[PDB]
Amino acid sequence: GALTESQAALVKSSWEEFNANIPKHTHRFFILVLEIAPAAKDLFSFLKGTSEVPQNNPELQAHAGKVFKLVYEAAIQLEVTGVVVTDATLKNLGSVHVSKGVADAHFPVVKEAILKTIKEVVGAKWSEELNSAWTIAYDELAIVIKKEMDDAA
Ligand code: HEM
Ligand SMILES: [O]
C-alpha cells in the first residue's frame, strides 16, 4: 500500500479519535486482550490479586495510552520519511518487557486488540484503505520492539 499521503492522513485522523477517550478505550483495550488470552492477567501488577480489570486505575490508563501513541507516531514517520526510527525509549521498552515475563507470541494478541479497538473507534469511516494503513504502522512498530526485547534477554 505504501503509506500515500492519503493513507497517513487516514491514521492521524483515526488516532486523534482514540485519544479523545483514554479511560474507555484503554480499559477496552485490556478486556480485548484478556478475551483473546486470559492467562495474560498475572503479568500486570495492577491486574494481579484483582479479579476484574480495574476501570480507574491510573497505573492502567497511563500504561495503555502510551501504547497507541507510539503506533500512530510510527505511521507518520512512515509516510514522510518512508521508515520507523528506533530510539532510547524503544530500547528501555524492550527491558521492562522481559522483567515482566512478556514473549513475541504475546504481540498478535495486542495487534488484533488494537485493530479491533480502532475499528471500534472510527466506525463507518472504516475503509480498507484505513485497515491497511494501521496494520502497516503496528506491524512496522512491533518489528522494532521485539527487536529490543530480544536484545534485553
Ligand atoms: C507495539 C506494541 C507495544 C507497545 C507500543 C508497548 C508499550 C509499553 C510501555 C510504553 C510500557 C511501560 C509502561 C509504564 O512505564 O508505565 C509497557 C509495560 C508492560 N508491557 Fe507492553 N507494549 C507493546 C506490546 C506488549 C505485549 C504484546 C505485552 C504482553 C501481553 C506487553 C506487556 C507489558 C507488561 C507486563 C508491562 C509491565 C507493567 C507493570 O507490571 O506495571 N506489552 N509496554
Ligand atoms: O504494554
Q: Which of 110, 111, 116, 135 is nearest to 10 (CA)?
A: 135
Kindly report the protein residue whose alpha carbon is nearest to atom 22 of ligand 1.
67
**How many angstroms from the chain centroid is the CA of residue 134?**
10
Q: Is the dihedral of CA 86, 91, 93, 95 positive or negative?
A: positive
20 Cβ partners below 8 Å, 6+ apart?
none
Q: What's the CATH number where 143 sits?
A: 1.10.490.10
Q: How many beta carbons lie within 10 A of that of residue 149, not counting itself?
A: 19
- Domain count within the chain: 1
Q: How far is the CA of 35 from the centre of ligand 2 (A)?
A: 16
Ligand 1 lined by 62 (C-beta under 6 Å):
yes
Mutating to test ligand 1, I would choose from 41, 97, 107, 138 the residue with most ligand atoms within 8 A of its C-beta, which is 97
Of 8, 129, 6, 132, the closest CA to residue 74 belongs to 8
Task: State the Cα–Cα distance between residues 144 and 77, nearest whole angstrom.
Answer: 13
**Range(s) of the domain holding residue 119:** 1-153
45 is in an annotated binding site: yes
Q: What does the block give as the cell for 64?
A: 495503555
142 Cβ below 6 A of ligand 1: yes
Q: Name the nearest CA neighbour of 112 among 86, 142, 152, 146.
A: 142
Q: Show the cell assigned to 9.
A: 492522513
Please indicate whether residue 107, judged by its CB atom, sits closer than 6 Å to ligand 1: yes
DSSP secondary structure of the chain: ----HHHHHHHHHHHHHHHTTHHHHHHHHHHHHHHH-GGGGGG-TTTTT-SS--SS-HHHHHHHHHHHHHHHHHHHHHHHHSS----HHHHHHHHHHHHTT--GGGHHHHHHHHHHHHHHHHGGG--HHHHHHHHHHHHHHHHHHHHHHHHH-
